[PDB]
Amino acid sequence: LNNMLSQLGITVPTGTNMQLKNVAAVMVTASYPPFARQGQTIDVVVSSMGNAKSLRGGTLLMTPLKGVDSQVYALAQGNILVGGVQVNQLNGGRITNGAIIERELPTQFGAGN
């Protein structure tokens, strides 16, 4: 959060309380589809990382989705949707069309016989 604030233009002093409860660190996973185009969008899955109780109505903010090569292949941002005795998973949600592709994987399709 401090890194994001500094990037946006706000530099919080290193020694501070910063005890907030409206944010949660999450990991976002996406499935880069075959023949992915630059402007297309894909669905993403957001899962809590720390000790967050729930992600009911949270918003994912501009997370870069990278492949196994450490390259940014998509940008994910949007609103999380989670299910509202079999209770639903409130620490994991799905964003439909939440990720926009950025890079296109070269392919050999159409070459050869």
Partner whose binding site includes residue 62, from its own copies, another protein, none (CB under 5 to 8 Å by kind):
none
* Comparison of 67 and 83: residue with beta carbon closer to another protein: 67
The yes or no reply on residue 11 touching another protein (CB under 8 A) is yes
Are 36 and 82 in contact, with CB atoms under 8 Å apart?
no
Which partner from the list another protein, its own copies, none does 51 bind, CB cut-off 5 to 8 Å by kind? its own copies
Q: Which of 84, 16, 82, 13 is nearest to 45 (CA)?
A: 82
Give the position of tokens 């589809």.
33
Give the closest residue to 78 by CA, choosing from 32, 105, 41.
Answer: 41
Could you say which residues in the range 73-112 bind another protein, by CB under 8 A? 73, 75, 100, 102-103, 105-109
